[PDB]
Structure formats: C-alpha cells, structure tokens
Amino acid sequence: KTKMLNIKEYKEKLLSTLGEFLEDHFPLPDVNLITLHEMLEILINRLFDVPHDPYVKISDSFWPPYVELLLRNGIALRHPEDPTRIRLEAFHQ
Amino acid sequence: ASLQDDALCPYVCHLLYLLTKKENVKPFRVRKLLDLQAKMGMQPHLQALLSLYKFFAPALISVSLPVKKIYFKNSENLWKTALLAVKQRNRGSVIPVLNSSSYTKECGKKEMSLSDCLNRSGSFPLEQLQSFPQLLQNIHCLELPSQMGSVLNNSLLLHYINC
Amino acid sequence: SGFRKELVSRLLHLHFKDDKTKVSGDALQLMVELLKVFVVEAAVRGVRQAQAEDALRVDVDQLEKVLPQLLLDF
Amino acid sequence: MEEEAETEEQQRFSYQQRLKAAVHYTVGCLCEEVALDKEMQFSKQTIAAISELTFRQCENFAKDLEMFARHAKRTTINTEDVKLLARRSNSLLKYITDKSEEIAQINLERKAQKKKKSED
Amino acid sequence: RQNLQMEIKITTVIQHVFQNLILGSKVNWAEDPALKEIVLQLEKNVDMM
Amino acid sequence: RPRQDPHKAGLSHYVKLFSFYAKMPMERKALEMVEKCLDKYFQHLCDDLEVFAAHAGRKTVKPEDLELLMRRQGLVTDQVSLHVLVERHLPLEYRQLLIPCAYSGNSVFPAQ
Amino acid sequence: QPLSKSTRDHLQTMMESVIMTILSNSIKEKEEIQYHLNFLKKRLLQQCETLKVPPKKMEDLTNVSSLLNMERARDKANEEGLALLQEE
Amino acid sequence: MALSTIVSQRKQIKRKAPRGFLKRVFKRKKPQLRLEKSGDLLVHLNCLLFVHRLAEESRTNACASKCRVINKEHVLAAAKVILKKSRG
C-alpha cells in the first residue's frame, strides 16, 4: 500500500501540473474546435481501452496546426498505410 | 531529441555514448534509432551508438559488426592545446571472451518476482567489477560469466572461485 | 460520324465532383472532336502494330501492346 | 428507403449502359471509317475493347477540367482550360489549337451576322 | 499486485508526454523554479519509488 | 589542382542519391546519361511552371502551383496530401519552414 | 449433376454482350426493355443453375477456334509425314 | 574496384539540399520570373520523387534481362517512360 500511496500521490501531482501548463501556454484556440488538452485525453484513453487497435480517425475538430505539434515531437504517429488515422506512442513498452 | 537535426547528429552521438546507462535504454527509444538508420544508411557514429544499446538490452536489438576502427573521428579539438596546460595543472580464441550471464535468464516470465517487486537485494553486474576494492564489497553476490572458461585469465574471478 | 453534342455533356456531368461545375457551349463543342481524335488515334496505332506483325486482321492481342503508350501520350 | 436506393443505384447503373450503348454505337462507326482506307479488318472484340477504353478515358478528362477551372476561380469551364489538357503531346497541341482558332473564326463570323441583323 | 502493474504503466506514459510538450513549447523552464523541479523528476523511474 | 563546373556540382548531389536507391552495382557509363536525364527534366519542369502561373494571371510562382503539378503527376492524390509527402522525405529543418504548427500561445508559423 | 461454373460464366458474359449489342441499335423505350431483358436474363441464370446434366469436361469457349486451327495444322503435317513414310 | 563500375552507396550523404544551385538554374532559364523564398525547397522535393522513380524502373529492367549490373540501355529505357509520366 505504501508503494501505491507514493505512486498515486506522484501521479496526481504530475497530472495537476500538466493541466496548469497547457492552460498557460496553449489557450483555447480563437464546427467547434476542441482544445489540445481535450485531444490528448482522447488518444490516451483509446490506447488503454483498446490495446489491440488504438488508432483514432482525424476529424474536423482537430485543427491541423495542433496535429502537426504532436506529430513533430514524436508524441503521435500516423498509420503506416492510411494517413487519415493517428495513434499514440507506446511509451510504457 | 537533437538526433533529428542532421547538423548536430555526429556530435550528439558522441555525447550520448558517455551518458548512456541501463535505465536510459527504453524500447521506444530503440525504435527511434532504427528509424533514423533507414533514412541515412550506415552512418559510422550510429553504428557505435547502436552497439552500446545492444549490450544493455540484448533482448531487443541484434547487431553484427565487421572488424577495431575508430568510429568517432579523433580530430584535434580547439581546446586540445589548453588541455595540456590544464593537465599540467592537474599533474602539479581458445579461451572464451567475457560476457554477461546468458540472457535466457528470466526469458518468458508471467510477472515480476515478489522480491523484485519489493526491491530486495539483487546481483552485481559483471561489467561494473573492475577493481579490487569493488570486489571486496560484493564477493558474496556476483554474476557468473556465460562461459566459465573465461575465468582462466581474469584475476578477480579467480579469487571468487578460490573459495 | 461524330459524337453528339448532348452525348458528350452527359458523360462529363456524370463525373464532376461539384454540381456547381458548368461547361460553356464553345468548350463543350471543342471537347467533341477531342474524343474523336482519341478514338481515331487508337485505331491507327492498332493498324501499325498489325502491319508489323503482318497479321491479316487486327485482334485484341495487338491492341494491348500499344495500349499503355497511348495513355501516357494523352 | 433501401429498396428505393437500389433502384436509384439501378437507375444509375442503367444510365451507364445507355451511355455505353451510344458510345459503342459511335465507336463502331469510327472503326469502320478507319477500316476502308487502312484496308484492314477489325475483330468484333476490338471495337468492344476500344469502347471500354474510351469510356474510362472520360473520367480522367472530367476531373482535370474541374480541377483546372477551380485553379482560376472560375465555376464554368472555358476553352482555355481545355488547351491545358492537350499539352502532353506537342503534335496534338498544335492540331487542337488550330481547330480552336477555326472555332473562334466561326464565332466571329456568327457575331458579324448578328451585327448585320441588327442593321437590318 | 495487479494494481501495481496498471498504475506504473499509466504514470510512465504521462511522464514522457509531459516531457515532449515542454520541449515543443520552446519555453525556458530553468527560469521558473516551480517548473524546474518537475523537469528533473520526469526521468526518474517510478519503480524505485 | 581541381576545377569543377558549377552546373555539374548541383547534378552530382542527385546522382549519388540515385546510386543509394538503386541498390545494385552500376556502370560508370550509366552515370553521365542520368545527368543528361536530369537537365532535361529541369528544362521541361520550368516550362510547365510558366503556363500554370500564366493561367492564373500572376507571373510569380506560388506553392499551390507546385501542388497542382504534382497532383497531375499522380504523386499527390486524395489520400496522400502535400503535407504527408514533406513529412516522409525531408529533414526537420526543412519541415519547419514548410509545414505550419501552432505553438507558444497559439502562434502559428508559417501563417496559414 | 450440375454443370460447371464456367458454363454460366461464359453464357452470362455473352448475354451481357448481346444485350449491349441489341440495346445499341434501339432508340426509344429504354427502361422497360432493359428491365424485361434483365429479368429474363436472371431467370435464365436460375433455370440453367437448376438444370441437371451428366458429367463432362468442357474447354473455354473463347479459345476453341485457335486451338482447333492448330489441330488442323498438326493434322495435315502428321498425315503427310505418315504418307511419305508408308511410300518409302 | 574498377573505375568503370561504381558499387552501391552504403551510406547516403547528408540530406541537406543544394538550395543555391536550384535558384541559379531556375534563374537562367526563365530570368523574368521571381520565385518565392520557400519555393526552392519544394522543387527539391519534386526532384527527389523523380530520382526515386528512375531508380526503381531501372532496377526492374536489369533484373528482367538477368543482369547484375545496371547498364546504359536499361536506364535509357527507364528514362522514356518516367520523363513522359513526370510531365503533367
């Protein structure tokens, strides 16, 4: 439990700081466009909920300059055959 | 991340050669290096870095390298003459080769051991053992070679097999 | 001996991506002989291949040999 | 809805054969018009092969003209757009533009006739 | 134990995602002390914790 | 005592890159006529760029003219865009100038 | 036993060809004529699929003519050769 | 290795593009034009895809003739198809 307590405490601090960082440096952009922080949550969940098929289809909500930001730094990858679908990098493996 | 830019690639490879430890090698970083190799081909400074990655994680990469040429060019740096002043201030096979224990240890494992989960003790890696004071502390727990004939010309392992 | 004016327009409107696309009469007129030249040119090439093969008549096999070169030219 | 959709698909399918039959009727006439001076006989399958080839070539032409017109911000295709498509063959380009000049001359003649009607 | 196998994996992913966002934003993290100490902790493994 | 034609300096870049993709030993006589192929491509490439620009009514050559050409070449299709092709074949430093990405307060460079 | 899939493949194909030919020469009354012809075609497909025939082997209809021509050529060559040998 | 035959390049040179060369060649042929600052890079991209096409087609011809060394008649045949395809 003590190992769990430290791990869970660490994750909450990490997640809380990440949310503050996005609000200060990437405000909501000026069909409705969702924010970058909302985009990240979609990709992360799909990676864990569906381990075998984590690909997500690009929609009009994702306005392209944000998509290039994730793709350039290595956080996201296009599907090798269909460039319409992107996934999240498997960091834990 | 600087490996992406072609201008700094040879120099970053030299820097990453020294800093690399076991914790740094991770599977996702292993895929990045292979991707860079497809785009640029057989770059000598990449071949050195890949070999260091194979040594730490042989279960991920397999490299056979031809034979030892100097991969990183030993060009005279701008501060080489000054280092001489700084150094003055500071001054003023029949037998098998040594290799870590065979990586079929663990191999297919359902889950980590309870002792490992609690971070209890462990073993001393063979590469770290290079001095007699280091042998004195860790005589009771050691990692044996893959092939036991390599102990023949290693003086520090003879002290272990003496008793 | 030529394609009908209405016939050509029917084919083009079938494959337009956007319905807002319209074809002017003079341009639609000029399209008519363009298809005719394409059909005429294909027949001539088949005759050339048949004469080289010295065949008594043009068949499918001779047509296929000169088929891909025509598409690249057009 | 589903029964209606397949009928519309059938109507779309049926509309193809009417164009196919008209094209095949026209192509067959041209092949015979090629036969007499070339004194060469064409197998019936060859005319069918040409008919399919000509039908598939209209798809490439249709998209390019729409693409070219959109480049110039023109919703309607003009004569200038068609001249672009013919540039792959220099010999064909010279031949096709001569007819365009001939059509322009005829249009000028038509305009001259209209002026004469206005005077009368 | 199965809870350990899942909380560790999630924390690892958040660590590396947060690292790359800081790099791509092109900001001077060393200037802010509050953000500075977060950066140093990202590389450290959660297993040792 | 070397003297090099500046025209041959440019072609030598693509000629070496040719031998990388071929993955076969290649005869020396094949080298120079590949150089003959390259200049012909450049000459015909520039001629085509005239008409597309001339058709639009502007003499200056803008990137969308290059997009229109490659679509006719078959390189660019509905699935594969212009941005996708840059990502696959070009280094990072060239990517920044071409493909726009927003960062640091929604600032986008280049503006799009 | 039912006949082979090739028979229906070939007969189907030749019926689309002949339907295309007969619609080529017709001007008016398109939809009704093509609907009736398609109904007749599909019903004939059903009838021929239901049909029963003693087993047999058939080669494709497209290539019978050429192979037949080479068979006559071989016929003539072998006949003249045998006649010459017999005379000797 | 003989001077006449060059072995395949194991390592590709740095992916840096000769930007200066492209500007002058475009300048001399059509002096009247002005090209946008980033137009040189896209032209370089267009040239890569051309050379990539040329290398693939030449290899097929050499393998078709059972030749282990790419020869001049193989690549000239490759040039005719690609050059027409490359113009649009």
From Swiss-Prot, chain C:
It comes from the Eukaryota. GO terms for cellular component: chromatin; cytosol; FANCM-MHF complex; Fanconi anaemia nuclear complex; inner kinetochore; nucleoplasm; nucleus. Heterodimer with CENPX, sometimes called MHF; this interaction stabilizes both partners. MHF heterodimers can assemble to form tetrameric structures. MHF also coassemble with CENPT-CENPW heterodimers at centromeres to form the tetrameric CENP-T-W-S-X complex. Forms a discrete complex with FANCM and CENPX, called FANCM-MHF; this interaction, probably mediated by direct binding between CENPS and FANCM, leads to synergistic activation of double-stranded DNA binding and strongly stimulates FANCM-mediated DNA remodeling. This is Centromere protein X. GO terms for biological process: cell division; chromosome segregation; interstrand cross-link repair; kinetochore assembly; positive regulation of protein ubiquitination; replication fork processing; resolution of meiotic recombination intermediates. Signal peptide: none annotated. It is found in: Nucleus; Chromosome, Centromere; Chromosome, Centromere, Kinetochore. The keyword Cell cycle applies. Its main location: nucleus. The gene is CENPX. Belongs to the CENP-X/MHF2 family. GO terms for molecular function: DNA binding. Pfam families: CENP-X (PF09415). Keywords: Acetylation, Cell cycle, Cell division, Centromere, Chromosome, DNA damage, DNA repair, DNA-binding, Kinetochore, Mitosis, Nucleus.
Curated annotation (Swiss-Prot), chain D:
Its main location: nucleus. CDD domains: HFD_CENP-S. InterPro entries: CENP-S/Mhf1 (IPR029003), Histone-fold (IPR009072). One of its GO terms (biological process) is interstrand cross-link repair. Pfam families: CENP-S. Ubiquitously expressed. The modification N-acetylmethionine is found at M1. It is found in: Nucleus; Chromosome, Centromere; Chromosome, Centromere, Kinetochore. PANTHER family: CENTROMERE PROTEIN S (PTHR22980:SF0), CORTISTATIN (PTHR22980). Heterodimer with CENPX, sometimes called MHF; this interaction stabilizes both partners. MHF heterodimers can assemble to form tetrameric structures. MHF also coassemble with CENPT-CENPW heterodimers at centromeres to form the tetrameric CENP-T-W-S-X complex. Forms a discrete complex with FANCM and CENPX, called FANCM-MHF; this interaction, probably mediated by direct binding between CENPS and FANCM, leads to synergistic activation of double-stranded DNA binding and strongly stimulates FANCM-mediated DNA remodeling. This is Centromere protein S. It comes from Homo sapiens (Human). The lineage of its organism: Eukaryota, Metazoa, Chordata, Craniata, Vertebrata.
From Swiss-Prot, chain E:
Self-associates. Component of the CENPA-NAC complex, at least composed of CENPA, CENPC, CENPH, CENPM, CENPN, CENPT and CENPU. The CENPA-NAC complex interacts with the CENPA-CAD complex, composed of CENPI, CENPK, CENPL, CENPO, CENPP, CENPQ, CENPR and CENPS. Interacts directly with CENPK. Interacts with KIF2C and NDC80. Interacts with TRIM36. Component of the CENPA-NAC (nucleosome-associated) complex, a complex that plays a central role in assembly of kinetochore proteins, mitotic progression and chromosome segregation. The CENPA-NAC complex recruits the CENPA-CAD (nucleosome distal) complex and may be involved in incorporation of newly synthesized CENPA into centromeres. Required for chromosome congression and efficiently align the chromosomes on a metaphase plate. This is Centromere protein H. It is found in: Nucleus; Chromosome, Centromere, Kinetochore. Belongs to the CENP-H/MCM16 family. The lineage of its organism: Eukaryota, Metazoa, Chordata, Craniata, Vertebrata. It comes from the Eukaryota. It comes from Homo sapiens (Human). The chain holds residues 199 to 247 of 247 of the full protein.
UniProtKB/Swiss-Prot annotation, chain G:
It comes from the Eukaryota. It is found in: Nucleus; Chromosome, Centromere. Belongs to the CENP-Q/OKP1 family. Component of the CENPA-CAD complex, composed of CENPI, CENPK, CENPL, CENPO, CENPP, CENPQ, CENPR and CENPS. The CENPA-CAD complex interacts with the CENPA-NAC complex, at least composed of CENPA, CENPC, CENPH, CENPM, CENPN, CENPT and CENPU. Component of the CENPA-CAD (nucleosome distal) complex, a complex recruited to centromeres which is involved in assembly of kinetochore proteins, mitotic progression and chromosome segregation. May be involved in incorporation of newly synthesized CENPA into centromeres via its interaction with the CENPA-NAC complex. Plays an important role in chromosome congression and in the recruitment of CENP-O complex (which comprises CENPO, CENPP, CENPQ and CENPU), CENPE and PLK1 to the kinetochores. This is Centromere protein Q. The gene is CENPQ. The chain holds residues 74 to 161 of 268 of the full protein.
